[PDB]
Amino acid sequence: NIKIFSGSSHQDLSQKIADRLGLELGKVVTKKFSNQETCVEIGESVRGEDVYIVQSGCGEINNNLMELLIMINACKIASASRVTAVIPCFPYARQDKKDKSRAPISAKLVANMLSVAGADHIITMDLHASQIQGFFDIPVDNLYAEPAVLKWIRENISEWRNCTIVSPDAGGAKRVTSIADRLNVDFALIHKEDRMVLVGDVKDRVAILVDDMADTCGTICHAADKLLSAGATRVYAILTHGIFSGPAISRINNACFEAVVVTNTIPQEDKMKHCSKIQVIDISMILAEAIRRTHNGESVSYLF
Amino acid sequence: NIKIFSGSSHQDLSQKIADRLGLELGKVVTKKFSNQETCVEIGESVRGEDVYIVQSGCGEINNNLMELLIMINACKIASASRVTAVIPCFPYARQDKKDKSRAPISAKLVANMLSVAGADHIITMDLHASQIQGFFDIPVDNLYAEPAVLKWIRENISEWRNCTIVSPDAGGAKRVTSIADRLNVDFALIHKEDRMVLVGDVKDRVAILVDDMADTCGTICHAADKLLSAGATRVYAILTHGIFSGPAISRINNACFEAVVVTNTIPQEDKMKHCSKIQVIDISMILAEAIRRTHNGESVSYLFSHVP
Amino acid sequence: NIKIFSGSSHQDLSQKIADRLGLELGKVVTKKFSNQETCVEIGESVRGEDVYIVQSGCGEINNNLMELLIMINACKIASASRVTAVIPCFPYARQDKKDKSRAPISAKLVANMLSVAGADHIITMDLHASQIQGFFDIPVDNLYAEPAVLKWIRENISEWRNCTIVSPDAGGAKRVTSIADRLNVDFALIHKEDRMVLVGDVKDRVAILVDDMADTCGTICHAADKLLSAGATRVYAILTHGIFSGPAISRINNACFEAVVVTNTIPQEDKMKHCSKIQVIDISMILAEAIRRTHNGESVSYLF
Amino acid sequence: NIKIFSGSSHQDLSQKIADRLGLELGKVVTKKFSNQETCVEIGESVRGEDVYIVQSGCGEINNNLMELLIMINACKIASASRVTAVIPCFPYARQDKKDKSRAPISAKLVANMLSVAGADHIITMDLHASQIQGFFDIPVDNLYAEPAVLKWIRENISEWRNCTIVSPDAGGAKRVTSIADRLNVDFALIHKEDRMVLVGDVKDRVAILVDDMADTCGTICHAADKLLSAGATRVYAILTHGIFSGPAISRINNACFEAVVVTNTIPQEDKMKHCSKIQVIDISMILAEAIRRTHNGESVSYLFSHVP
Amino acid sequence: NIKIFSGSSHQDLSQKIADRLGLELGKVVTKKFSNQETCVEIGESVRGEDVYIVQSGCGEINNNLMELLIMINACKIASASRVTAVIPCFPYARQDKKDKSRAPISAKLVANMLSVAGADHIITMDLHASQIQGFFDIPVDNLYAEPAVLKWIRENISEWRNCTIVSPDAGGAKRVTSIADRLNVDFALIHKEDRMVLVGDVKDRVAILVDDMADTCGTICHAADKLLSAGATRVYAILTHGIFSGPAISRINNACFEAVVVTNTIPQEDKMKHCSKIQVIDISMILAEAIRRTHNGESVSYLF
Amino acid sequence: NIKIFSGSSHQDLSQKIADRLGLELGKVVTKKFSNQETCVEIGESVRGEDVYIVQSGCGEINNNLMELLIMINACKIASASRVTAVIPCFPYARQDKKDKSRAPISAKLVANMLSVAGADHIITMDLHASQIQGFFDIPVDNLYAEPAVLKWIRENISEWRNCTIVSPDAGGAKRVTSIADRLNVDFALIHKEDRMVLVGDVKDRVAILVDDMADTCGTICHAADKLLSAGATRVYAILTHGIFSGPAISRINNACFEAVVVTNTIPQEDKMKHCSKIQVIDISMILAEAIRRTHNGESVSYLFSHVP
């Protein structure tokens, strides 16, 4: 009744999930034609099944999105009973408002595409902005890495009881004050005027940079400089979505991060070989549980 | 081709906008029946017209909201060419996410209601969260009070070049840094844990609390005290939307504000009689200009940084 | 699997319904903020449940409608399996046509709002016009109070065998001729030219004014005058929806109604203290049965 | 910009409307294939045009209906600027509620079909139930035959000032009281239980049976007898839509009507050859005027009480 | 749980289907009023049932389509759990593109009508063009008569091992080369320049004209002439949809067809009396199986 | 009122079309962020404008497709009056049926995506299957390369009056018979079973392979050999869409074609440097004319048989 399928190539997360549920991943013939078109073939009947498609990480977002959309649609027209898109890192999430510009709200576009492709339900982790749930008319379960991160901080930072949770930018304020509050420690915020300004106290205390995602890590790496200058004992960076593209990985080594922690919502095994300070929090149990619970009509909020 | 209607009763804003466009407000037969049901009847043909309906202010939200939806509906089935909802302060805007709860995203519900009623276009001012534009599939013009605010600051606060812009909560960080950067001054931030923590320097500077909206004012009042305790010379509060429900006017009369500045997106006239700290920025010209441009197909973005 | 929730404050009907089904009403934190906005919080998981929201009667129709809409939506995005709005008295039902005016069809608006809020199913009683079922694309079960009213007439009017069922206006013709036919008695109709005209026979016979609803009762009260003048032995008024707002309750005492009968689709307990002639027909069993039967895939038409 | 097309065949009404607008009917290649499928091909560009399609009358409803939907479809995907369905007599209108049965609301189905085919606007005359406007989300203009009827009465019935307007059923009460009030005369009402009961005074007065439509005429014929038995001097029947299917023309030839008056919303020419009681009010001017106004963005409500 | 209903009058197929499933056909009061309007009344509760409406064949396509639409809608508003339209021969299928003209895409119109009427699922046989499945957003199971036709050819044509499958027109190429390939025999194609051109080899070999449907049979009958002229031993015509309207039946006798084979997707019993060469392949088992399998969440592709 | 934008980068076609209309391409800020996400920002107001977005050619389909959808989206919420997607070669067009498999109908998915993004109109050239117009509910103009092809043949092949038009597969039958009939010449057909069978006469005639698109060219290359073996004097291949991915240019350099003719619906400039057999028909005038007509409300059908 429950069927789990994976996006192209990136199967490690999807395999971890299927394992925890006692299932094998569904058969699918996924490829790319010589001329770049996404080719998909669901290799088994999904008629009347509860289907979960777990998003791939070939690091080509548009190919990954089209592949997801094609699979949702194939399952829908093959009379699956229900189709859930499981999308740990939601594409174009950062493009969720116009911001004074004549820009697309791409995240709303993506929501509409998933909807028209035929998704009945979304499962995702740490949406860039919670309002993104408002982009759908179908139910969205938005899981949080927060509890997994708190656990890690307490269990890996000896001075965590007097540390400071720092936001790389102005927008990240709500996220850090939530974490700092849970830990009962100080928070501080960085703003790029360029010159970086710091408000709050970091002097003679462990500083933990917390952000939802880091791409090129330009901001996260400058942030670490400023924090050192301001007398931070040691600096950590915690990101739930480790995109780490471009100069990201080199800047990280070239920076003073005692460590950089991410979840495996994006595949990290390649980069970990090229970056010693990276540690991954496995989130496959959270996702498996959300699927199992979604499937059984059981409470998901429990994982929040 | 252009036609402007007012929701019920608080017709001031509606009248100021119509005046600035050279128009009379359209005729409406708009009562509430014995059982509390909204009555409407568009008293003139709107056939083939570019219709703008301005949300009425009497502060009873569900009535104002239903009245607006009914008028949108009425104009659409009477074959208006286009129907734009002009909603200076967007209802249920503070209900735009789940916040780890089994809650409605009521702002999305409101957007869906406006959509099915038949709105083709929305004009609003300072959405509580910009993502709310993402709640519609029709175009939304979200005007800013910032240019009018920056102007008020520069012309009313002698020490503006040395002031600090302060957010009363963590969620207002981007809004205040944006103002601080434009003015080229400092910003600070208050975070409520039953205590407030302040980060950023305010000592021996004028502090300006800037928020999108103030309701019961519990927060801004405590923020002022906190700011004075941290050494602020004096304290201003500048809100775009002055809801001021319940005990707010009493909290303001007693608070250590030098002044509380709000726009007239929400009617303030009666509130001002009981509260001398309240000053009002008129935003009718910005709304009037957004309507005029929308109707002409002219750039509306000009107003995002420019007071007309 | 079945979950029943009530609208704000008005719980008496909703409680009667939940009792007959052997259920407790679902937990919900409903309130109104200082600034008039409707605040709702579903206080329990409704995931995979068959949910019925029974409409409140705070007598503020717009607050009651918004509260209903918010609750439907909250249940939908919390992955309820099905959401039914149970709405004994359908708001804006009288606004169901333009009637030569440039008016809204508000009842169609309300249907659209409920639909977009995410209702899968409607249960209602005595719609002002049956065409209102046409306003939805989702199924509507429109229950009738007719059988409950016939029972009451036979059991409370000694002369019912030679009485006359009278319609207050021209529009109510179909409703009364149906009742008069079932009873095998005379019907008559009133029209407001103002001066009231009466067609049909009422002389020396019990006259029963039957209407779907009465608000201010101005029409129902003038009607009773005319009927007396025309030689009605005694006059009764039967209304399925007793709104009774404004001068309604006083005009009723000030009128010659042997009695005024209503159902409890709208809360009547307050007004009954202020009006001796009012008697209520409990319709909670009809509604409970419709819910139970809706839930079990059992026939509802049986109650018609 | 204005373009008018006729459904199949009964092109009279369509031609009268086009004539009154100064137009030729648009070219259509419109046959029915060997297997009973409708064929259409719009014989001219409609790109960017204000298109009106007038429903054809041949009385085979499902064919007329499918033909209309296919032409709506054809014009929309050929990029017409707007497509209006002109449907003098609305199909399945008597199927607009469930009536305590497991029945379709076929009129709602028809509305959905017209909508998905791509109609932007509907123009119709005397919907069987006004609520049918509520079946669409697009605007509907529901024109009335009343002004044309009132005029016919005043000019053809000497005793109109002392007549009685009579509804043949309980469902027509509002329609007849409306006419009676305007004329300032009496109204009465027939209710069929296998017997008819009459309420209201008709004695020694001319009785005018007024209904929205007559089909087999079983009812109006029995109503006439009933009215004469109650002392009516003579009896008229005035319908807006003269369906007259099956044995109707035979029931009319034998009935005690002085006259049976219908509009030409349904073609009557062939029926009149076999029935001398039938007179026809031409409604093409009302339709022509509704189209002209719709196209110009001019008030259509004027016609609700005013014969053009 | 499974309920099967039939379109008007034409019950033979629908009865065959209901038999194979061990069911009686559902009660429905279907008729045509004096004034041509389709009258339907579902004569039993379908609440919570899995409903299949099998399309009638009164040979009046518009009446058959409206009747189907009305029945789908009636079941939907009576809270059927699921409604499938079973439509062996899809109306307006030949009107599925503009073809350089200002024509309707009627097949898309029909798809939209069925969808808005409330169909959840379509079952059909040999769509004129497979892209027609693209006209729906709901699942379509498109059954093939191909296997039934191959069986018949092998079992009724002695020379089938060296026969030629011939397409009446250019458009039918894909269909015949598929059949010819499966049989491992020759294919040929006819084109109307009018004068008919033939490409491919038919000399001294049994020629089988294969087409998805034949209406007036003008094309199929001229085709047979040309094939004789080209030295075809004997000519057969195989059509899955035998419409056979107008001069069709007479032209067939007047032609040299050793036989004309059709399926019973359209009622053939009347015409078979007037045409000796007609043989029907019963497809009621294929349809019953597709319904049963659709109902049980079982694989349908198996029948392909 | 008319505004033309180009997708990313392969801006040639876009520029040729804009040139022919007398326009400059609209300003776009269009990059791809570090993580492969498409960036767009319409660099000018499109408010109230008739917007045409021309699909960019860089051949990475999912990126081109997402870029197009994002720009459609951007223009619609910036209140463009209308947004038309100009998609010379329609993506996933070869995925427009199930083919007895559990496959997506990806072309229908693409249509749905274009629709929800907010396209009001599509302009395309030679859809792989005409039924694809049936995948949209908005109007689609599917232009033909045939008139330009017929012209190329008549002016470049001396023996065109005695040539044979050949389909490389069973699915192209209608397309080649259509060309053969117009030219009044023969047609033939290849069907791949691992072998090819040819039906129709090509002996001692020039053979012209005509297809909608060529990708890896495996098929057309084998078809040429087959055609020469059957006695064709020489062999041409004429495609509307020259995808030429993977080993195609190498298959062409080695194949027995006299010439391979393609339109510029797909950019060919770089491909031509490595392949001297390739000639290019410019279709920018046809696209330019379809846009101009669409904007003016003028007949577009003229181009279906007439090279502008």
Numbering used by the authors:
A (entry chain A), C (entry chain A), E (entry chain A): 3 to 195, 203 to 313
B (entry chain B), D (entry chain B), F (entry chain B): 3 to 195, 203 to 317
How does the study describe this entry?
The human PRS family, which has 3 isoforms (hPRS1, hPRS2 and hPRS3), belongs to the class I PRSs that requires divalent metal ions such as Mg2+ as the activator, inorganic phosphate ion for activity, and ATP or dATP as the diphosphoryl donor. Due to the important role of PRPP in the nucleotide metabolic process, the stability of PRPP content is essential for cell physiology and is predominantly controlled by hPRS1, the ubiquitously expressed human PRPP synthetase. Mutations in hPRS1 affect vital cell functions and are related to many diseases and disorders.
We determined the crystal structures of the E43T, D65N, A87T, M115T and Q133P mutations at a resolution of 3.0 Å, 2.14 Å, 3.3 Å, 2.11 Å and 2.74 Å, respectively, with 2 molecules in each asymmetric unit. In the D65N structure, the salt bridge between Asp65 and Lys34 in the PRS1 structure is replaced by a hydrogen bond between Asn65 and Lys34, which might reduce the restraint of the ATP binding motif β2–3. The low activity D65N mutation affects the ATP-binding β2–3 strands directly.
